[PDB]
Every structure is written in C-alpha cells, then in structure tokens.
Amino acid sequence: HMIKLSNITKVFHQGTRTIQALNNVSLHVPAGQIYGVIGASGAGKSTLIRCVNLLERPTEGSVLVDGQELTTLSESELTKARRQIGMIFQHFNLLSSRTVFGNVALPLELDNTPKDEVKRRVTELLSLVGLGDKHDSYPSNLSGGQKQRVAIARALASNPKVLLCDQATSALDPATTRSILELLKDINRRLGLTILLITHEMDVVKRICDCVAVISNGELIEQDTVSEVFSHPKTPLAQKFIQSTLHLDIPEDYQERLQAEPFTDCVPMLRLEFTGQSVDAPLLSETARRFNVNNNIISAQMDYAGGVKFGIMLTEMHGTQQDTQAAIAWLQEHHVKVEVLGYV
Amino acid sequence: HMIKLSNITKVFHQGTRTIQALNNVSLHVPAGQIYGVIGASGAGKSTLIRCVNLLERPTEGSVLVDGQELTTLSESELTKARRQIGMIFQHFNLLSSRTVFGNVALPLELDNTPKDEVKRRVTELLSLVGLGDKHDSYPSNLSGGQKQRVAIARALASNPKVLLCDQATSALDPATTRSILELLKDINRRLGLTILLITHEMDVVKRICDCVAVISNGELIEQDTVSEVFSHPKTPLAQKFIQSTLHLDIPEDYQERLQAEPFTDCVPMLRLEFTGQSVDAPLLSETARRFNVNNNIISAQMDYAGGVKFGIMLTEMHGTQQDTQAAIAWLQEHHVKVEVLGYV
C-alpha cells in the first residue's frame, strides 16, 4: 500500500469563475504495481496525477505517499519528499543545453552528490534504459524514444519508490510505444517500482497496468483490475470508451452477399463478442467438435488482460441447423454475446 | 483511363549536388478507384504524388490525366486541370484569416463565380462531412479531424475527378483517422472519385484501397491491386510493411510464466501466422476436431481481404503429446506457420 489519495478535491478560479477539476476523489494504490487512470480530455486526469507530487496543491484532500502526509510538509520538507517521486511527461521536457549524461545527472546535483558518485549512478542508469554509447549526444539529435529514455533515466536518478507517467506514449510512434512501455514494465519487475499512469489511449492500459480507474467530470467513476473493467463495463461511460473503441469491421465483399432472412443452402454470418471468459476455457474448440460446426474466422481481434479473453470476432458457421442453433447457444450460455448479422 | 503517369524521373538540384528522388516509374489508376503508394521516410512518395498535379516539375516523362498530358508546359492552362485535380495535405494548410465557409469558397472565388453560385456548392459540401453545425468558426477553433473535413470540401469545390491526398491521416488520432478514411470512401463511391494517395502507415492502405504500390529508394518495386498484393507480396520490403500490421504481444503475465525447456505438466505456447490461405478451409477448428486438442485463443489479429483469412494468432494448445505434435504439424502441412514460443 504505497501511495494513497483521500477525498481529493481541487478547484482553480479565474475571472470571478470557479471550475471543479477534482471533486471528492479517493485512490488506493498497492505497492509495486502499475496503476492506470483514464478519462475524458481534461476531465481531471491531467490534474489528478500531479496531486501526488504536489505540483498542484489540493484544495481539500489528504495525500499519503510512503506513509507520509504531503500537504503538511510545507516548503522545506517537500523538497526532500520529491526525491522519492520521479516524473516523466508527454512532451519529453528536458534541457537541450545539457547532454544525456548531464540531463540524467541534474536531479542528483540538487543533492550535492560528490564528484564521481554521479558518474557511477548516471552511467549505469543510462545503461538500464538502453542509452550507453550516446552519453555525449545532445537531446537535439535524439529521437522521441531516445529523449524519453533519458527522461526515465532522469526520474530514476534518485532511486525513487513511485513514478509518474503523464501520457508518455502520446508523442511516440506505434513502434516505439512498444519499447518504452516494455521498459517501464521491465523496471517494474526488477526494481519493484510503484507507477501511476494517465493515458488518453486504451492500448496502454491493456499491456502494463494491473488496476485501471475511470475518472470523468472530476470524480472517480470505477476502480478495479483491468480484467474486471474490460470484461464487465459497469458504467455507461466506460462502456462507451471500451466497446465502441474496438472494431466491428464487417468487410464489403461479404456485405453485398448478406441477407436479412434465411436462404436456400446457406450459412449464418455472426459475430462473437467475448465478455471476459477465461483462457483455460476451450469454448471455440469444444463447440467446434461437440456440435460439429465449422467456425471459420473471417476477422478477429482479441486481447489478453488478467487471465481473460476479450474482444470481437466475425465468423462463418457451417453445419446442421439442428447443430448450429445449439452451438450458438452453448457459447451464449458460457457468456458470449452472439448477434446474427444476416446469412450467406 | 485517367490519372495515368508514364516513367517520371526527377533530380534534386541544390547546386552542384545531384540525387534522384524519382527514377523511371510508371503508374495507372482506373477511373473511380483508390490507389495507395506506400514508402519509407521521404523516399520519393512525397515527391511523386505531386507530379500529377504538377506542383513539382518532372525532368523526364509524361502524365495522362483525364486522357490528356500536363507535361507540355502549358503555363496557366493548368488552371482547370488543377480545378479537376484537388488536394489535401498532411498539415491542413487552411487560411487562418478566413472562416470554414470561406476556405471552401476561396478556390471558387478564384474563378470569378457569383456569390450566390458559390454559396450553393459550399453549403452542401459542409453538410457532406458534418460541418453544417460549425459553419462560422475559424481554423483556430476546429479540432484535428474537423480541420481536415473542411480541407476535403475545399478541394471538392470545383468538382474534380481526381483527388490527391498527401498523408491525409498522418497527424490525426486513430479514431479520427478512422472516421476520415470512412468519409473518404463515402465520397469515393458516390460520385466515383479517382483517388491517388500516399501514407507512411500501411494501415491506411489496409483500411481502404483498391490498389497499392511500395516505393523504395526511388523505384517502384511492387505494383498490383490490393486483393492480389496481400495474396502475393513478392517484395522483401513490402512484406515488412504488412508485417507491421500484426501488433502481437505475448503479454507480460505470460512472459513471466514463459519457459524455455518444457517442464512437468504444461502446454506449448504457439504463434500461428496465417499467410492468407482461405476462409473456406477451417483449419483452427478442424485441427481441434481431428486430433482432440484445444486451441485456446490467447490473443489474435486476423483480417479479411480477397477471399481469404490472414494475420497472426497466439494460443496455448492443450492435450496429448502425440496429438499436439500431429495437429501442430498438420497446420504446417496445410500452410500455417507455427512457432512454439516456449512452454507454459
């Protein structure tokens, strides 16, 4: 139980007008776990993450990091407490004047770290992220990932307990978003680092984090494991940003072959939405041989989170009508949403 | 028919410096089709697309457009040819000075049309993409996709046959990109717009294109229709572009459990790569039927084009050893690449 938030409420007032960014929000984070917080564009996710590091001072609330109250620290004591919280941002936010060595070494120089203690720590922290070689290269000629790697190396210059990623994947290309997220995870497994996230994209939530929260209109709507969130959508909001955000292709070459009602010597087209079944459940396999039906996968997308299958599939199903009916029903009874989208 | 270019070559002159961005490349797009041209980082795709509209001048070649060549050096006769070849860029290139109404009007005000006549084509083209709602807003207000939507109506003001799209959906987010290309085909199949385009993402071509070609080092190393390009990807590079559309994972919950040498009571973790064999042959089910194994779909991405299923899949195959071996080899025999990633 590392970082914890209790009834966080914050409002900024400009031009004799007050606005609620956060309204009574509590977030419990376990020690050494990755934690996502998704939300609507500027729904308070932007502000919420930085309440932990006290970049934004809370109007009402209590922030407990490593079992310590942050609001009571005032000025002098917070400087020491922020050593244990590293942070990296959407845009990579680093000094272009200093090289990667110096950029990672900067937070250590605030502690008056002597001589080569910084050389020992920087070189190895740079080796961790993947930047050896380029110790003397300036940020000017670094790529998005390369910059972000310096940023990760920089935030870990204090060997902190908690880490804060503000949309780190955002500016990175689909190829390099892989690497950086995997690097964060590799650290999570090695150092046992606690991590808080806020991401505008869903694919980030699937791959790394354990528990994901949904925050919209300045209040925490859902809090559960990723497994439970994508399986059972709970709120109508989360269901919108989860179900409507995944596929349903329905190719055109089949579209024109499609019918409304039955057809002489035909087969039903249907799609299977997986509601979070289980990986040990051999549904498509058992259904195929017990009922004697050919489930031909025309199109499919399904992802893994927390030991459960979920996604969508477009499939052709042949076999006897006596069988086909029962076949669909067996899956249905095992929690598989099945729509009949015409016949072929 | 139309938009048919003949062996265009061009040299990049800074000076005494000489490098050929384009070298002897022809392309023919039938009237009413979407033709993609994919390439590497600025490998001449950026230079090529605009040889049709004659933004940049070719050194050697001819270009048939609507059954006529523009290579004759016709001075201002390109006007109506340019009115019949519209364009939209990566950067929306809107006029900040003018409203969303006028941006579409400007190309039409260039032709000395009456103010009422222009009001006809604009109001309809605004309602086309869904801009009838925000008709008075400036470019500074409009969102990423909404800024492109006006650009689409912009090029269509003078009612062209051909529409050139230079990386149209590059700076747009996945959901917006999805809505834009959807609107691109809608306008394609309605009036029968001839569309030549270029994108660094193979996705864009994968999402919607009638034909595709891969440009590399200034040469066109592949040319075929989309259905046959996926079925016959001959080029060693062209396959690597389609290879990036697979988005496989082997998630972290598994990779921890993953094992090199087989241990007591486990199953092989398989990764099935479908080359594009058939949607009619039900291999995944019939292999479970035949050898009594369970293909548990951990995660998969598979798509349909040209009368066949393709893509990748990740599963854990349960059951007897001799059966697993038979089944897994059966799939190989039936043209499915199977790879044991480890034991789990």
Place this chain on the structure above:
Amino acid sequence: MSEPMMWLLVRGVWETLAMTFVSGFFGFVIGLPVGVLLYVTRPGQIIANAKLYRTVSAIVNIFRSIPFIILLVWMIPFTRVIVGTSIGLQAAIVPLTVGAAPFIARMVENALLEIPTGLIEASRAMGATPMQIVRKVLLPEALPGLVNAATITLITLVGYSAMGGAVGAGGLGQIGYQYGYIGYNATVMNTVLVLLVILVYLIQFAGDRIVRAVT
C-alpha cells in the same frame, strides 16, 4: 507654464505627429514593395534568384545599421538639394523615411515569413498566379503582423522626430532640446515628456486594436 508657451507646444504635438505619420506612409510605400521583394527573392521561395538577395539584403542591412542621428546629419547635404530648404518638417521627413524604410523592410520580410510554407503550395494547387497569391493569401494572412509592424515603426519615428528636433526639424524634439539642455525648465520639459509618452500610448493602443480587431 505660461500664456503663449501652451500654444507653442500645440504646434509641437502636431509637428511631431506630422513627421511620424508621413514618414510611416512614405516609408511603407517605398519599403513594403522592397519588403515583399525581399520575401520572394529567398532561394527557397517562389522567384528564387539567390543572386539578388546577396545584394538587396546587404544594401538594406547597411542602411539599417547606420545610427539615425549620424544618418540625418550626413544626409543634410543631400536633403538640402531635394526639398531645397535644409530645415523644418518638410525637409525632415526625408531623412526619417530613409532611415525607417530598411527597418520595415526586414520586419515585413520577417513578419511575412511567419506564414506557414505549404499554404503557398495549396495556393498553387488551386492554380492561381503568383500575383493572386500575394493579393488574396499571403498579404491578408500576414495582415495582423503588418499592423503590428506598422505600430512599431510608427513609434520609433516619434523617437526619431525627437532627435529630428535637435538638428533643424520642428516638433517636440526641439522644444525639449531647447528648454531642457541649455537651461532646465522643469515645467516645459516634463510636459514634452508626458506629451510624448501620452502620444506613444495612443499610437500603441490604436495599433493594438487594429491588430486585435483584424484577427
């Protein structure tokens, strides 16, 4: 103050205003043309012609580099023959326009470069001639930058006109030089300072709203 002194400052406010506004107009008239020429004659732009930009830029650079009072005084012999007086407003505005043109020359070229490249291409995608683009895309897009550049070169001339007064010209420049330097009359001196500061805010604020309202 005094009885007639007040009515003398009235001429000064006028004379100072008259020199600045006319220098601006005659400045922009001879500068904006060389300003758009300087934009297009960049090797990357439409006309190309990298040969002339090696000279056309250098000649504007050499003028603008000269301090105004050393220009004004060196330009006396030349100003004597043009206007045929050597003194006063009508004579003074020539040195003002000569010194202020290079200033706007580069600023217009700079403010016109703030427009996005590729808006130039989309303009060729529609098929307009290079004079139509300079008419209805380049100019009206950079307009908020031009009126900002107008505001700057208007107020700098108010300062040039001050120094104008110290050498032969009329305006508050002289009144300040006359009652402050030779002997210090606080009332008159403070008034010339207040008038000019008040004058610049009225040029500033007028320029601000014409820049704000054109957006």
Place this chain on the structure above:
Amino acid sequence: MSEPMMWLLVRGVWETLAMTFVSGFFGFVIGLPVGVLLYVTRPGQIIANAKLYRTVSAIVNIFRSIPFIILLVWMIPFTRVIVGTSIGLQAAIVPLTVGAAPFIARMVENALLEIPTGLIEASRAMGATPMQIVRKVLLPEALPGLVNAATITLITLVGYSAMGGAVGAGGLGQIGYQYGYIGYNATVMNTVLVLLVILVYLIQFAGDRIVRAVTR
C-alpha cells in the same frame, strides 16, 4: 584628411565603445534581474504574484516609451547629482542605462519565454528551489537568446551614443555632430559614418559567432 585630425577619430572610437560596452554591462546588471522578475511573476508560473507584474510591467513600459534624447535631456539634472558633471563620458552612461535596462528587461522576459513550460514543471518535480531553477535551468536554456539580446542591445547603444554625442557626452557621436551639422565636411563624415557601420558589423558578427558556440 589631416594626420592629427585622423587621430581624433581614434579618440572617439575609444569612447563610443567605452560607452556602449560599459552602459550595456550596467544594463544587464539592472535589467536581467528585472527581466527574470517579470518572467517569474507572470500569472501561472513559479511565484505568480499577479499584482507585482502589473506594477513592474507598467514601470518598464513608461520608461521604454520615452524617446532617448527626451530622456537624456530630462535626466540631465539627476545625471548631474548622480555623477556630478552632466557632461562627458562618465555622465553619459547613466542616461544610456535606464534607457537600456527596460530595453533589455523586456527582451530578457521574451527570450526566457522561448523556454517550454515543461522544463519548469520538471524542475519543480526534481525538487529544486526557484533559485536553482533560475541558476541551472532557465538561464542556460535562455542563454542562446540572452546572448542575442546582448547583440541587439549593444548595437542600439552604439546608436544612442551617437545621439548622445549631440549634447556632448561622446566620441564618434560628437565628431559626427560637430563636423556635419554645422559646417559639413565630406571627408571625416563619411569616415565616421562608415567607421560606425563597421563597428556595428563587428559587434553583430561577434554576436553571431558567440551564439553559435552556445547554440543547440
């Protein structure tokens, strides 16, 4: 031209440099702090304090709004009490500064604004004190701009020296004023005009190559 009168131009180039480079120093001495004060006091920044920025901003606006010779002449009595002469090299710099400070104070604010906001959050995230931010984050990032701000303000001061030469505080300014305004002299006016131009190109060029040394 005559040999001893040529030596007078050498006496002036000494002074004209002496004024600008000294007055420029005292400019940044007073101005760079006021510039950083302005950047920090912007609402929505490290120590926001919006009322202080309303005061300090209006102060540097009114001073910068005053044309130079109106300032210099108006400052004469204070220039006298502060220096004691009101005439000559020492008295010259005080009116040059104070005309120079608000000039650069505004440039220092703007040049410091080129820095992305993200660096200041990262600075506070690492746990640095506002002085540590300004010392080793803001300044070094703004440095390439601040060096240009030097180049810009230094050449304008050369111009001010010239105008300042009319009231008899300066070298090339006075030699240009005396021999061209009353009793024009073709030679030496052309020399002082070109000798100032080449002096500007020298400090312009030296400003460019020094920015290249510290560039990205």
